[PDB]
Design an enzyme around this catalytic site. Structure first.
Site, PDB file in Angstrom:
ATOM      1  CD  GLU A  70      -2.991  -1.033   2.257  1.00 15.85           C
ATOM      2  OE1 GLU A  70      -2.985  -0.103   3.067  1.00 15.85           O
ATOM      3  OE2 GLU A  70      -3.937  -1.859   2.210  1.00 15.85           O
ATOM      4  N   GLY A 183      -7.118  -1.648  14.915  1.00 16.97           N
ATOM      5  CA  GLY A 183      -7.736  -2.647  15.778  1.00 16.97           C
ATOM      6  C   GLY A 183      -9.157  -2.411  16.225  1.00 16.97           C
ATOM      7  CG  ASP A 308     -15.721  -0.275   9.601  1.00 17.69           C
ATOM      8  OD1 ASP A 308     -14.955   0.130  10.507  1.00 17.69           O
ATOM      9  OD2 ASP A 308     -15.313  -1.002   8.642  1.00 17.69           O
ATOM     10  CB  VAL A 544     -10.052  -5.083   3.949  1.00 14.08           C
ATOM     11  CG1 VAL A 544     -10.899  -3.953   3.307  1.00 14.08           C
ATOM     12  CG2 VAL A 544     -10.912  -6.115   4.712  1.00 14.08           C
TER      13      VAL A 544
HETATM   14  O1  LIG Z   1     -10.633   0.016  12.726  1.00  8.39           O
HETATM   15  C1  LIG Z   1      -9.401  -0.066  12.451  1.00  8.39           C
HETATM   16  O2  LIG Z   1      -8.510   0.111  13.391  1.00  8.39           O
HETATM   17  C2  LIG Z   1      -8.988  -0.261  11.106  1.00  8.39           C
HETATM   18  C3  LIG Z   1      -7.705  -0.484  10.711  1.00  8.39           C
HETATM   19  C4  LIG Z   1      -7.344  -0.674   9.364  1.00  8.39           C
HETATM   20  C5  LIG Z   1      -5.925  -0.869   9.088  1.00  8.39           C
HETATM   21  O3  LIG Z   1      -5.128  -0.643  10.065  1.00  8.39           O
HETATM   22  O4  LIG Z   1      -5.405  -1.088   7.978  1.00  8.39           O
HETATM   23  C6  LIG Z   1      -8.406  -0.642   8.360  1.00  8.39           C
HETATM   24  C7  LIG Z   1      -9.697  -0.369   8.918  1.00  8.39           C
HETATM   25  N1  LIG Z   1     -10.023  -0.187  10.223  1.00  8.39           N
HETATM   26  C8  LIG Z   1     -10.871  -0.226   8.031  1.00  8.39           C
HETATM   27  O5  LIG Z   1     -12.041   0.106   8.583  1.00  8.39           O
HETATM   28  C9  LIG Z   1     -10.728  -0.425   6.647  1.00  8.39           C
HETATM   29  O6  LIG Z   1     -11.818  -0.301   5.847  1.00  8.39           O
HETATM   30  C10 LIG Z   1      -9.496  -0.752   6.129  1.00  8.39           C
HETATM   31  C11 LIG Z   1      -9.049  -1.082   4.785  1.00  8.39           C
HETATM   32  C12 LIG Z   1      -7.713  -1.321   4.871  1.00  8.39           C
HETATM   33  C13 LIG Z   1      -6.777  -1.744   3.886  1.00  8.39           C
HETATM   34  O7  LIG Z   1      -5.529  -1.569   4.076  1.00  8.39           O
HETATM   35  O8  LIG Z   1      -7.195  -2.067   2.766  1.00  8.39           O
HETATM   36  N2  LIG Z   1      -7.252  -1.141   6.175  1.00  8.39           N
HETATM   37  C14 LIG Z   1      -8.335  -0.839   6.951  1.00  8.39           C
HETATM   38  O1  LIG Z   2     -13.554  -2.434   8.855  1.00  6.55           O
HETATM   39  C1  LIG Z   2     -12.853  -3.381   8.454  1.00  6.55           C
HETATM   40  O2  LIG Z   2     -11.845  -3.835   9.089  1.00  6.55           O
HETATM   41  C2  LIG Z   2     -13.158  -3.970   7.244  1.00  6.55           C
HETATM   42  C3  LIG Z   2     -13.682  -3.047   6.142  1.00  6.55           C
HETATM   43  C4  LIG Z   2     -14.561  -3.954   5.286  1.00  6.55           C
HETATM   44  C5  LIG Z   2     -15.113  -5.030   6.207  1.00  6.55           C
HETATM   45  O3  LIG Z   2     -14.215  -4.978   7.391  1.00  6.55           O
HETATM   46 CA   LIG Z   3     -12.377  -0.227  11.066  1.00  9.64          CA
END
Ligand SMILES: O=C(O)c1cc(C(=O)O)c2c(n1)C(=O)C(=O)c1cc(C(=O)O)[nH]c1-2
Ligand SMILES: O=C(O)[C@@H]1CCCO1
Ligand SMILES: [Ca+2]
Ligand code: HEC
EC number: 1.1.9.1
Length: 670
Positions: A70, A183, A308, A544
């Site tokens: 990323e 987290g 979220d 994700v």
């Molecule tokens: O709630 C969190 O602490 C947290 C962490 C992360 C992360 O650290 O990459 C993502 C998310 N949420 C999230 O909601 C999300 O949609 C997401 C997409 C991605 C990714 O790298 O594609 N990370 C994260």
């Molecule tokens: O929020 C998260 O960590 C991800 C985004 C899509 C579904 O769960």
């Molecule tokens: Ca999240």
């Protein structure tokens, strides 16, 4: 040798004055966002709309990863630094395309399950001779720029609870290196910490949500925030969420830094804070004093977050004219589908307009508060969540070109349906509680009814003053990459379907493209080396959505591709639906519940999804499913991030999983 000494000398020069001086002409890309405002705008115009068609590959570099990549590379005097999967850092001599050094923090692979969204890293920070990386396991590590050897490290999770990870790039503002963590899907209390860049000494910490209100508050911002949470739900046990896992920016003139805060833990507002409350400072842009970490102000984008809806997506600081007056703003397009323009001198709301369809709010009122759509807060029955958890815009960078005045924004829709789990208890895993087997605590049920919206992906050129799209390019899939724009009137963006493309910044016309093999999620950077301009992108499908789905058939290792006008380097370089596994169809329902609780957010839905950087079980050879216990209990793939389900699955649970896997493939077979 020459590369190492060039690296030491180049990175030694990086400090605040250097980042500012690099503005007049941007020969270097010293921060992941080029400057402190993170505009991701290069002033270089050697590559322009008239000659970009003649871009060719200068060189490519093998990152050796197989999971998401990323990060945008940072480059100073032709010395590049970029991270890959599992927090590995690479220093590359762009004059040769060769490795200078690699730093591998040796993350315990058995801990891949601790993060929700792939084993990613959004980049490194440079400051006075050192390279800083936030590692998966919580270490903030400072490395020598010339050798890659550690200078110091800090265990940033010490004393804090829950399934914490780090995926974001650290920032260095005025000699303090700052990092957050991820987290909130598991249940943690969000915070960022600042350390002295030279020695690592902890300087300050700011939590984004209050702790137990019967304990001393860390500062007045926490006491004030507690008044917006209902204690009847004991939010502090699960932690509350609010993780600051991605965006941070800085305005030196205002001596103010800004951080985007995350979603609530658990996700359901009615479970997290029963009687209501805005739940500050979730889902906000927060302004802090960079020297002391003290709260200055905030603007909450999503009060009572219930879907979220993080606000961690990359913001851009910009100076634009609104209603004919010069304004110093923040541009931000988070998951909830609204494009926000905020005053960065005081946090005052300026405007918000949805940039994709949304169903949780009909708009924002004159006070900058959302006007809610009731159904979206009805957790008693399934409800499509638009934009939903994958977000209208996620972390993939956007960019701002001040000459066109447009923001090049990756937009998308990945359909999801949600309802509340009113019987959720923190860390009490069970069938049907999504990914609870590896620590998730969303307090939601997913797709109890199939979502009705259609997926899409598109590149929008958004006008923040008029609050409308100037142009839009439709892609075939959601989850396309971050953008880069330059004074050559071009916009670069990689696609989920495997290309790096340049578009005209004013019209969106496609001017040039090259294949990348695998889907692209990271944003490109551009810089000068010995009088020639180069464009580089680190390609590693993931994040994700990329764990479980893809839009190319081809899979390969993470690779940095670097282009130049005239380059001649040569470029580097599905399946059968599962059938025949013996199973008991009567066990499909039980298997469905066990699968949702233990496997779905890494392996997707068998057969329905095709697999991303983690293979789908519905397309594996039958031997893996027939002999499933061999793979889920201390299996051979633990070293690649497949968890051990010892103590989590037992008896006939694996037979039920087999029934769900083969049964689902049988149900959708043509
Ligand atoms: O709630 C969190 O602490 C947290 C962490 C992360 C992360 O650290 O990459 C993502 C998310 N949420 C999230 O909601 C999300 O949609 C997401 C997409 C991605 C990714 O790298 O594609 N990370 C994260
Ligand atoms: O929020 C998260 O960590 C991800 C985004 C899509 C579904 O769960
Ligand atoms: Ca999240
Ligand atoms: C993400 C944190 C995972 C969860 C949750 C589960 N699995 Fe997994 N699995 C994961 C990875 C990264 C891998 C390795 C992919 C590769 O080949 O590089 C796997 C692999 C498997 C396999 C194949 C095993 C092998 O040795 O090749 C199987 C059959 C498998 N996983 C099954 C499985 C099931 C049934 C799960 C829920 C109980 C499950 N996995 C969860 C990552 C993750």
């Amino acid at each position: 040798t020459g590369p190492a000494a060039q690296a030491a000398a180049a990175v030694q020069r990086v400090d605040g004055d250097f980042i500012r001086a690099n503005a007049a002409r941007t020969p270097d890309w010293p921060t992941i966002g080029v400057d402190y405002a993170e505009t991701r705008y290069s002033r270089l115009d050697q590559i322009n709309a008239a000659n970009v068609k003649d871009l060719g590959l200068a060189w490519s570099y093998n990152l050796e990863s197989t999971r998401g990549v990323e990060a945008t590379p940072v480059v100073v005097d032709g010395i590049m630094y970029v991270s890959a999967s599992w927090s590995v850092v690479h220093a590359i001599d762009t004059r040769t395309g060769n490795r200078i050094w690699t730093y591998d923090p040796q993350i315990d692979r058995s801990t891949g399950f601790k993060g929700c969204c792939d084993v990613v890293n959004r980049g490194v920070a440079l400051w006075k001779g050192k390279v800083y990386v936030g590692a998966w396991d919580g270490r903030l590590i400072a490395l020598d720029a010339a050798t890659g050897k550690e200078v110091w490290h800090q265990n940033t999770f010490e004393g804090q609870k829950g399934s914490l990870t780090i995926t974001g790039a650290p920032r260095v503002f005025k000699g303090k290196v700052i990092i957050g963590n991820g987290g909130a899907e598991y249940g943690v209390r969000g915070y960022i910490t600042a350390y002295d860049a030279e020695t690592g000494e902890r300087k300050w910490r700011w939590f984004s949500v209050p702790g137990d209100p019967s304990k001393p508050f860390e500062d007045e911002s926490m006491k004030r925030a507690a008044r917006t949470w209902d204690p009847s739900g004991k939010w502090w046990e699960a932690g509350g969420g609010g993780t600051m896992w991605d965006s941070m920016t800085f305005d030196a003139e205002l001596n103010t830094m800004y951080v985007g805060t995350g979603n609530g833990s658990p996700w359901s507002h009615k479970v997290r804070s029963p009687k209501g409350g805005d739940n500050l400072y979730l889902a906000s842009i927060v302004a802090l004093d960079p020297d002391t970490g003290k709260y200055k102000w905030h603007y909450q984008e999503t009060p009572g977050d219930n879907w979220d809806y993080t606000s961690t997506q990359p913001m851009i600081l910009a100076d634009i004219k609104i209603a004919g007056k010069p304004r110093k703003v923040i541009l931000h397009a988070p998951k909830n589908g609204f494009f926000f323009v905020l005053d960065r001198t005081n946090g005052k709301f300026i405007s918000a307009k949805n940039f994709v369809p949304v169903n949780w709010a009909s708009g924002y009122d004159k006070h900058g508060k959302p006007i809610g759509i009731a159904a979206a807060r009805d957790g008693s029955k399934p409800q499509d969540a638009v934009p939903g958890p994958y977000g209208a815009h996620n972390w993939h960078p956007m960019s701002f070109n001040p000459q066109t005045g447009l923001v090049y924004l990756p937009a998308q829709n990945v359909p999801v349906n949600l309802m509340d789990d009113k019987k959720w208890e923190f860390n009490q895993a069970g069938p049907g509680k999504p990914q609870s087997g590896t620590g998730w605590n969303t307090a939601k049920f997913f797709n109890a009814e199939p979502p009705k919206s259609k997926p899409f992906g598109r590149l929008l050129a958004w006008d923040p003053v008029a609050q409308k799209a100037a142009w839009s390019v439709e892609h075939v899939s959601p989850w396309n990459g971050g953008t880069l724009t330059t004074a050559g009137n071009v916009v670069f963006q990689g696609t989920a379907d495997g290309r790096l493309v340049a578009y005209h910044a004013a019209t969106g016309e496609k001017l040039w493209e090259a294949p990348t093999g695998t889907g692209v999620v990271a944003a490109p950077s551009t810089y000068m080396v010995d009088g020639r301009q180069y464009v580089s992108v680190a390609v590693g499908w993931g994040g994700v959505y990329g764990l479980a789905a893809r839009a190319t058939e081809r899979q390969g290792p993470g690779t940095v591709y670097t282009f130049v006008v005239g380059g001649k380097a040569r470029m580097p370089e599905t399946g059968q639906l599962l059938q025949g596994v013996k199973y008991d169809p009567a066990k499909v329902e039980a298997g469905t519940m066990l699968y949702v609780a233990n496997c779905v957010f890494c392996h997707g839905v068998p057969g329905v999804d095709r697999g991303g950087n983690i293979p789908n079980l519905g397309y594996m050879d039958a031997s893996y499913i027939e002999n499933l216990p061999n793979f889920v209990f201390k299996g051979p793939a633990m070293v690649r991030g497949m968890p051990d389900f010892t103590g989590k699955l037992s008896g006939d649970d694996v037979e039920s999983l087999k029934a769900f896997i083969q049964g689902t493939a049988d149900a959708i077979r043509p």
